[PDB]
Design a protein around this ligand. Structure first.
Ligand SMILES: [Zn+2]
Lengths: 34, 227, 104, 150, 183, 43, 765, 146
RNA sequence: GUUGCC
């Protein structure tokens, strides 16, 4: 879905955040976004 | 109609090639309802009635949203409510979701959510392409209906499909005059005496249009040697 | 037909690179890379009739063909090394890339 | 070593794909005969040329008659060759018909034929499959060792 | 009509060109900057260029996922294999002069994920010490036996060799006039 | 290179039941080529 | 004698067949074998060694077939017709020179016998090469014999020109009920036959192989090849602004399922599930066995360090698997002539020479150490005296390899039977028609009538009016009259040469614009990624017309995909055409008048730039012209002669452009069974069953084909008088009546000759 | 046959115009295939109607096609006037390569006399391009017996 | 037993 992560170009992943919030963050790169 | 037409009637094979079924209408005119039964019998796929499917989040919501083209229902002249679509999503055993979480939002906007490692992204991504290929109305078996005209003004209804039992029970078509092909479903539906008379009328059909003529009697002996 | 759509773009490729070698005269630590044909069987970049480009790097050997052609979304940086020592110097980045083709 | 005369049964050909078993061998006086006395050697019935569409044999003969009358071999090639319109002129300069179709008399009864006959030389090669090494007969002979059939 | 003479003045210097497979040139028609190199890393006989880059801090960092899993922080390193080709001259212009130099190798930089490689080498080492479950004399080369060689032998010599810690600097005028004085 | 067995010769491409039992080989036959003749009657 | 180029282009067609005959593929491969191809084999199996007593070595310096190095006479030899009636093999011995350690010192020995090779007639190592019917009259062999056939121990045979599907390239496959695959069979020249497959199970791209224990998905095997950023994966295969992103994006999340994410972790996912062939040492590293598992795969390309050129070769192979799922129009067929490779005689017996020659010098090695395991037998022993016991294994291997047409190979383990036949001496042209025929492979597609049919990409390549019927109705085909088979030249100079013509390298360009640009494929691999090809490809021909590069190269350039192709592999079919540069051809009849004076043959025309060869691929870019009266100002490649589409055994049909098209094939099966004459020495030979004919006649209407092969000089059949009419009822269908008189005068008196033989045997007592 | 070309070439140019008659039966750009197939199977018939009526008696193919001995009004019409158009399992000789049939003919040129139709008679002769297209339907006449 | 051909 054109989910490019900057400085790694890998992927994005919808992460179950704190208190079940839907933050998006990939593995294998320390990057996050609301 | 040739050598690969004789081969499967003698074999009585299960998966036949092109089983067309012939069902006649009630009336003769067009009336803006002669093709209204074609909507009630063909595989009405929801990707033709949807236009714009997208995922949206506010801050804590994981729900896919679909919308329909309300101005298209009257064009191909099918008739259905909005709630029966919301029935049809949970009428799909391929998608393993909960039975009733469907909530209507107005007249044309409809949403369904998902909630439970890493289930949440994958279960909304498998869900994204497995939605626009579910049947909503019509037969779940047949493929393509075609209306044509013969040397009379009467119009029939072709269906290139397998099932016959649900073709007869629907409205707009009379169940008295519904011939077909593919012998060994007629044995399931119309007793046994119909299955004998069918293999008579099929063999001399595909010998009628090859030029030669065998006999009506040399198949009447073949007709009951199998049944 | 479609043979004519080649020459007009190579015609327009002369002017797009003649502007670029003119703006770059201010030597602001700018670089461009381009490939010379080896295997000889120095010269001078020249301007022919109505803006046509050629080099003559041989005593007689003429190379008409030059063309600015590659499209690349990458940051390329020329840097020198020397003898595995304290010799890491970033000089500058590269604006463009042309080629040299001997005509036949 | 052995030689043999071509009696009936053998397989003659025509170089365009018209097979033939020799039907019967008749004496010399029974065939037709032209104004100069030429006896035709081999007679084909006309029931092949409409179905098999072998127009090449019909063009072989028009170039066939004209060559030995002029004394020069003629070039019938592929996708061209000796044309037809200049080949009819050398035939008619001698006295024969313009389409090769000369008339004949009947060798049986002596008078003319009500129709005309297409006429001349065709190249016939003999083929294999002669009959005397296919004639076979077994009255009461050997039996196989395992199942005792012939 | 006109002529712009060129000469080649380059020896003894094997200058290299890197290629950023991550970073684009322009952001809305305006070219961005090239990032600041913290340090470098080179190994001879295999010609790797291990460039280190540092990241932005807590705003786009998510440190409590980084500290709790691998404990290797603020470093994105990326690897590029240097490859050789002929031609490919680099040129700067003077006013009505243009001077050239041969490029010796070209590397293409791909993001070498250091720490997730390093995260599992500890995971296997602890697995041995949970349940450890337990002698070299010469052999003879035989003419009916093969020995490992070719491409995997290059990985046998690219793993243990001498690093050189580069002092990354920014010069660019010393080499510039060095070409000008040479004809 | 596979060995012929009992089951390898009752069935198959004329092992038995077509080549020796259904359709047999017979004595007192002959075989020559055909040529026409009008002068003799039918039968 | 006012000549022009309008109708007198025909008079160069015999100049092509004068110096370059009718048996071109059979002799010019065996002549390439005996001179050059044997030195390249002793240099690949030299220096046999013994581990016991390690200072003993036998190495081969050269190899020769025929004459010695001492006497330097031509040859001492039995003539072949003296050999073909004594049930012997026409052979000349093979001589080598060897040096080794006898003892106190090393010595070299010259002209050692090891075996006796058979030599095909009219090859230059026979007596019959360049004879002028005076030596050949002494040797009672016919001047009009075609040649090119073995006479092994009596009956004379010939191997056929067999072909298979094009190795070392790719195809695509489309299937409805199973999912769609694409094959890529490759063959390294030693002991490997590996083929790779890419399968789409239920909407996901996959990958399997016959050395991996199970299936390994696609995102792993590209991250193991270096391309790891996972945006470049989509950037290679899909491009931009398309539907390919919607189909391919399913594959990317299986990298997230297995949690790999880097180039280090990608490899050992393969080697965890590799099928382990035991090398009996097995020091497996769990990092080194995966790099070789990513080396023994798709053996077109091998790598040193960087994996990169192998990586995107897989990426281009997986681009065409998503182009086919978009629409099934992108499918190719595996019976198109461009995906066929004819490969000829001498480079096909060379494979059988390997499995015998390595079987020679290992049992000979096993005889050495059995002697050298003695304490006293160590000082003055010589090893050469036990070479004659192993000598004839080469001979008796080769002789049954031609007699019984089945070849037991070992380095491929392959069992091609029916590779030779006994040649038909029934007619003259029957002894030449079988010399030019092609036997297919029979991969059990008996239901598919595709290759049974005849494709239109065949005009002048190989004959269209000749094919047998019945047991094989479309699988036995015949070469055309003007026809040459290519051969491999080299590949590293043109890769250096295309760089000079203005192309770059793959290791500099990003995939952001290779789909914007074009790409050269050298034997199916992307190496340059050129743009503006019509400036590029026209400069390449003009080097070839001047002859700086070899002329057997094709510049097929399609536009359904954004790619151009190069071919240099050799073993593919082609014909020559004359160059037409513009609205006037390069015929130049003043050149053509100088040919009939005789000072320049056909070979000088391709030196100056008036003719070049075209294969099946280069026909697709060209716009070839029939006649000079039909030149368009956009029109190249005029036809050299239009009736060159029929082979040497169909050419005797007169006016074949008038008759119906099936009634030429029914004569090609029966021209080869025509009684006539055989040779000038036909009353001398003692063969099994020959038919001879008393009074032959040359046919009345000739053809330009039959004067090339001298069919008129010993023809078959007479030309009798035919009067087509019905008569007496005895001709109902296709019967025919002939007199009692003319056969009595001698019309078609045939004559039958039969051999019988016995052998007087000497028993034990 | 020239007026058969003159009705064909006007129909083949309406791809830039993009007209589609849309016969019931789901054409999707094959009306221009099926209308030319009905057009070229017409011109073969009335040309065969000229040869039968405009012909004297005592023509030997005429007298054995008046009877049912051997031959037909189609077989005599292909020997004197026109051989017609070759059919391959209900198809008008599909392309060999690059949307064309043979390297004599221009790119993507969907005309008859280029794909399937051959215009001259057996008495006239055949051209090197049109000889092969008759030599294809001569093949599958032998294939189906196997 | 195995191939070739009508
Ligand atoms: Zn990231």
């Amino acid at each position: 879905m054109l989910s490019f992560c900057p400085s790694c170009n890998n992927m994005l992943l919808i992460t179950s955040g704190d208190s079940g919030v839907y933050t998006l963050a990939c593995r294998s790169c320390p990057y996050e976004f609301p | 109609l040739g050598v690969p037409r004789i081969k499967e009637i003698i074999n009585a094979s299960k998966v036949i090639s092109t089983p067309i079924i012939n069902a006649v209408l009630v009336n003769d005119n067009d009336e803006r309802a002669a093709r209204v039964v074609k909507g009630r019998v063909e595989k009405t796929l929801l990707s033709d009635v949807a236009f714009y499917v997208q995922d949206v989040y506010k801050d804590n919501l994981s729900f896919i949203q679909v919308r329909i083209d309300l101005g298209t229902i009257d064009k191909l002249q099918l008739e259905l409510t909005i709630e029966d679509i919301a029935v049809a999503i949970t009428r799909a055993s391929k998608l393993k979701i909960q039975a009733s979480d469907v909530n209507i939002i107005g007249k044309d906007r409809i949403a369904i959510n998902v909630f439970p490692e890493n289930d949440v992204f994958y279960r909304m991504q498998q869900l994204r392409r497995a939605l626009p290929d579910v049947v909503v109305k019509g037969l779940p078996d047949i493929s393509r209906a075609v209306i044509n005209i013969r040397d009379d003004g009467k119009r029939e209804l072709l269906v290139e499909g397998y099932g016959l039992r649900d073709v007869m029970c629907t409205d707009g078509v009379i169940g008295s005059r519904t011939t077909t092909n593919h012998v060994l479903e007629v044995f399931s539906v119309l007793g046994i005496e119909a299955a004998r008379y069918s293999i008579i009328r099929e063999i001399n059909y595909t010998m009628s249009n090859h030029g030669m003529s065998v006999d009506p009697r040399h198949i009447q002996l073949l007709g009951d040697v199998m049944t | 037909k479609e043979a004519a759509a080649e020459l007009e773009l190579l015609n327009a490729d002369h002017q797009h690179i003649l502007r670029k070698l003119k703006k770059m005269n201010n030597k602001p630590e700018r670089f461009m890379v381009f490939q010379l044909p080896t295997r000889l069987p120095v010269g001078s970049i020249r301007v022919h009739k109505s803006g046509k480009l050629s080099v003559k790097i041989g005593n007689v050997v003429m190379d008409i063909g030059k063309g600015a052609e590659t499209t690349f979304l990458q940051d390329v940086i020329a840097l020198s090394i020397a003898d595995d020592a304290s010799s890491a110097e970033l000089l500058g980045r590269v604006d463009g890339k042309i080629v040299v083709t001997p005509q036949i | 070593r052995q030689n043999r005369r071509p009696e009936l049964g053998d397989k003659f050909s025509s170089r365009h794909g018209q097979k033939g078993v020799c039907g019967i061998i008749v004496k010399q006086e029974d065939m037709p005969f032209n104004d100069q006395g030429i006896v035709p050697d081999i007679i084909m019935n006309p029931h092949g040329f409409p179905s098999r569409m072998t127009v090449g044999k019909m063009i072989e003969l028009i170039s066939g008659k004209a060559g030995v009358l002029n004394g020069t071999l003629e070039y019938g090639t592929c996708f061209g060759g000796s044309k037809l319109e200049d080949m009819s002129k050398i035939l008619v300069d001698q006295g024969f018909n313009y389409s090769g179709k000369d008339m004949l008399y009947s060798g049986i009864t002596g008078e003319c034929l009500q129709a005309y006959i297409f006429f001349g030389p065709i190249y016939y090669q003999k083929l294999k499959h002669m009959v005397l090494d296919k004639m076979h007969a077994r009255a009461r002979g050997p039996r196989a060792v395992l199942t005792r059939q012939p | 009509i006109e002529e712009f003479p060129l000469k080649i003045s380059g020896e003894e210097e094997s200058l290299h060109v890197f290629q950023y497979a991550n970073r684009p040139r322009l952001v809305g028609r305006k070219p961005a900057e090239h990032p600041f190199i913290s340090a470098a890393r080179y190994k001879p006989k295999s010609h790797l260029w291990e460039i280190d880059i540092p990241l932005d801090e807590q705003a786009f960092y998510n440190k409590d996922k980084a500290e709790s899993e691998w404990n290797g922080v603020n470093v994105q390193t990326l690897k590029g294999v240097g490859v050789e080709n002929n031609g490919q001259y680099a040129a700067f212009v003077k006013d009505m002069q243009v001077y050239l130099v041969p490029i010796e190798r070209v590397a293409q930089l791909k993001p070498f994920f250091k720490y997730i490689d390093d995260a599992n080498v500890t995971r296997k080492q602890e697995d041995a010490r949970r349940n450890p479950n337990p002698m070299s004399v010469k052999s003879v080369n035989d003419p009916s036996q093969n020995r490992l060689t070719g491409s995997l032998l290059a990985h046998k010599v690219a793993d243990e060799e001498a690093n050189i810690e580069l002092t990354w600097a920014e010069g660019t005028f010393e080499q510039f006039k060095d070409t000008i004085v040479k004809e | 290179k596979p060995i012929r067995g009992f089951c390898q010769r009752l069935k198959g491409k004329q092992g038995r039941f077509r080549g020796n039992l259904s359709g047999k080989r017979v004595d007192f036959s002959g075989r020559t080529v055909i040529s026409p003749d009008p002068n003799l009657s039918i039968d | 004698d006012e000549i022009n180029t309008a109708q007198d282009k025909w008079h160069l067609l015999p100049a092509f067949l004068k110096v370059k005959g009718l048996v071109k593929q059979h002799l010019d491969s065996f002549n390439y074998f005996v001179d050059t191809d044997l030195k390249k084999i002793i240099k690949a199996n030299q220096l046999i060694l013994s581990d016991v007593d390690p200072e003993f070595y036998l190495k081969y310096v050269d190899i020769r077939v025929g004459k010695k190095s001492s006497s330097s006479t031509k040859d001492y030899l039995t003539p072949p017709h003296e050999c073909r009636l004594r049930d012997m093999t026409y052979s000349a011995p093979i001589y080598v020179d060897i040096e080794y350690t006898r003892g106190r010192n090393i010595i070299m020995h010259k002209d050692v016998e090891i075996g006796r090779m058979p030599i095909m007639l009219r090859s230059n190592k026979c007596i019959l090469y360049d004879a002028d019917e005076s030596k050949m009259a002494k040797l009672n062999e016919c001047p009009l014999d075609p040649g090119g056939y073995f006479i092994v121990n009596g009956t004379e045979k010939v191997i056929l020109v067999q072909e298979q599907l094009s190795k070392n390239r790719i195809i695509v496959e489309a299937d409805e009920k199973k999912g769609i695959v694409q094959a890529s069979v490759t063959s390294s020249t030693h002991e490997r036959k590996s083929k790779t497959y890419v399968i789409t199970k239920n909407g996901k791209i996959y990958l399997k192989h016959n050395s991996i224990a199970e299936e390994i998905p696609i995102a792993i095997v590209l991250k193991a090849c270096g391309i790891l950023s996972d945006l470049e994966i989509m950037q290679l295969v899909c491009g931009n602004d398309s539907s390919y992103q919607d189909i391919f994006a399913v594959n990317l999340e299986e990298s997230s399922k297995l949690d790999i994410y880097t180039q280090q972790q990608a490899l050992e996912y393969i080697g965890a599930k590799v099928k382990t062939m035991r090398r009996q040492k097995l020091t497996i590293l769990q990092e080194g066995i995966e790099a070789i598992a990513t080396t023994v795969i798709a053996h077109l390309t091998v790598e040193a360090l960087d994996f990169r050129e192998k990586a995107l070769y897989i990426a281009m192979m997986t681009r065409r698997v998503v182009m086919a799922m978009y629409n099934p129009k992108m499918i190719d067929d595996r019976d198109y002539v461009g995906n066929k490779r004819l490969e000829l005689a001498g480079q096909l017996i060379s494979l059988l020479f390997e499995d015998l020659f390595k079987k020679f010098n290992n049992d000979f090695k096993l005889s050495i150490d059995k002697v050298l395991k003695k304490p006293n037998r160590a000082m003055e022993y010589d090893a050469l005296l036990s070479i004659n016991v192993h000598s004839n294994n080469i001979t008796s291997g080769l002789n049954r390899a031609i007699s019984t047409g089945n070849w037991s190979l070992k380095r491929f383990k392959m069992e091609r039977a029916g590779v030779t036949h006994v040649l038909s001496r029934l007619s003259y042209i029957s002894a030449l028609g079988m010399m030019t025929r092609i036997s297919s492979q029979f991969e059990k597609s008996r239901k598919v009538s595709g290759p049974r049919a005849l494709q239109p990409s065949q005009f002048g390549m190989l004959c269209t009016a000749d094919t047998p019927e019945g047991e094989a109705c479309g699988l036995v085909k015949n070469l055309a009259l003007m026809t040459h088979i290519t051969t491999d030249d080299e590949e590293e100079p043109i890769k250096k040469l295309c760089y000079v013509l203005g192309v770059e390298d793959i290791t500099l360009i990003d995939s952001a614009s290779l789909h914007l640009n074009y790409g050269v494929y050298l034997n199916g691999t992307l190496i340059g990624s050129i743009r503006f090809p019509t400036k590029f490809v026209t400069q390449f021909r003009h080097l070839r017309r001047t002859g700086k590069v070899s002329e057997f190269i094709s510049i097929y350039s399609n536009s359904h995909q954004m790619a151009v192709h190069i071919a240099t592999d050799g073993g593919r079919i082609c014909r020559p055409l004359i160059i037409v540069s513009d609205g006037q051809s390069r015929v130049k009849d003043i050149h053509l008048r100088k040919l009939l004076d005789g000072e320049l043959d056909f070979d000088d025309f391709l030196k100056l730039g008036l003719v070049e060869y075209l294969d099946v691929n280069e026909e697709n870019d060209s716009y070839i012209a029939l006649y000079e009266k039909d030149i368009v100002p956009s029109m190249t490649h005029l036809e050299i002669e239009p009736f060159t589409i029929l082979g040497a055994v169909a050419g005797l049909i007169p006016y074949p452009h008038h008759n119906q098209s099936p009634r030429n094939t029914y004569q090609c099966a029966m021209g080869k069974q025509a009684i006539g004459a055989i040779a000038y020495n036909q009353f001398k030979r003692i063969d099994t069953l020959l038919y001879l004919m008393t009074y032959p006649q040359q046919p009345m209407v000739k053809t330009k084909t039959i004067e090339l092969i001298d069919y008129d000089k010993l023809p078959a059949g007479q030309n009798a008088t035919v009067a087509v009419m019905s008569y007496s009822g005895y001709d109902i269908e296709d019967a025919l009546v002939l007199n009692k008189s003319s056969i009595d005068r001698g019309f078609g008196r045939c004559e039958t000759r039969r051999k019988t033989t016995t052998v007087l045997k000497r028993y034990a007592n | 046959v020239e007026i058969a070309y003159h009705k064909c070439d006007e129909l083949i140019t309406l791809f830039n115009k993009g007209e589609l008659e849309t016969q019931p039966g789901c054409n999707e750009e094959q009306t221009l295939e099926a209308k030319i197939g009905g057009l070229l199977s017409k011109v073969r018939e009335e040309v065969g109607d000229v040869c039968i009526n405009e012909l004297d008696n005592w023509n030997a193919p005429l007298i054995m096609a008046t009877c049912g001995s051997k031959g037909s009004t189609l077989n005599v019409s292909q020997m004197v006037a026109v051989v017609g158009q070759q059919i391959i399992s209900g198809n008008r000789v599909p392309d060999g390569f690059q949307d064309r049939s043979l390297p004599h003919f221009p790119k993507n040129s969907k005309t008859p006399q280029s794909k399937g139709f051959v215009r001259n008679s057996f008495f006239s002769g055949l051209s090197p391009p049109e000889f092969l297209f008759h030599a294809i339907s001569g093949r599958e006449g032998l294939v189906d017996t196997a």
